[PDB]
Design a protein around this ligand. Structure first.
Ligand SMILES: C[C@H](N)c1cn(-c2ccccc2)nn1
Ligand SMILES: C[C@H](N)c1cn(-c2ccccc2)nn1
Lengths: 156, 39
């Protein structure tokens, strides 16, 4: 299959027509997405098969073909870019200054950008183009808008 | 049967559209991976 680094749509033909259920990142031969996009199922890339290798429902993350490779972190000061890949629409960079999710176990950056559910998995990048996490797991706030955590895995 | 299709390179774009606010929220993360607001 196609193994070139980059951002990819995750599609299904199970529902009406071809439906985009999410997005992910190919880096160093490993495909990275959010658990809720694939539910841990196998994926196809052309005639090739991508099998799950690691996953965790609480982190809402999954890697295919190898271990999680993404380890850049938001610096807590600077603007980042969401590389939004919405269903049926061209990849588009959106720049924003993250907010913060404060938890009993520490703080994480959060982006206040509202896209369709099939955009989940889209990468958030720093100024060097490194992926600091994936968009698509978050909360619905007072006015009904959406705020996503910047979800990042651990590189073993 | 899920399948993937390339949508682009991962790069920073100079002069991209700039939007969104920066809210500071108190949240809880449950065992199912769901975030919820804490008040
Ligand atoms: C109501 C929901 N949060 C929503 C979806 N969309 C949307 C944005 C970009 C592309 C396509 C659709 N705008 N609001
Ligand atoms: C501290 C580390 N940079 C981190 C944690 N997480 C995370 C987000 C949601 C659920 C689980 C984990 N994303 N990045």
């Amino acid at each position: 299959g196609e193994t070139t680094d980059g951002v990819y749509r995750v599609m299904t033909r199970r529902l009406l027509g071809s439906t985009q259920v999410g997005v992910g990142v190919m880096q160093e031969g490993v495909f990275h997405t959010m658990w809720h996009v694939t539910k841990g199922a196998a994926l196809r890339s052309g005639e090739g098969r991508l099998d799950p290798y690691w996953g965790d429902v609480k982190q809402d993350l999954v890697s295919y073909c190898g271990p999680w490779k993404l380890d850049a972190a938001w610096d807590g000061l600077s603007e980042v870019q969401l590389l939004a890949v919405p269903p049926g629409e061209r990849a588009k960079n959106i720049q924003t200054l993250p907010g913060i999710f404060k938890t009993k176990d520490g703080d994480i950056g959060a982006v206040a950008l509202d896209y369709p559910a099939g955009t989940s998995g889209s990468p958030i990048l720093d100024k060097c183009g490194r992926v600091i996490g994936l968009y698509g797991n978050g909360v619905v706030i007072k006015n009904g808008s959406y705020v996503s955590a910047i979800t990042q895995g651990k590189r073993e | 049967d899920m399948y993937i299709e390339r949508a682009g390179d991962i790069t920073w774009e100079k002069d991209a559209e700039v939007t969104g606010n920066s809210p500071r929220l108190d949240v809880a993360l449950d065992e199912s991976g769901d975030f919820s607001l804490v008040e």
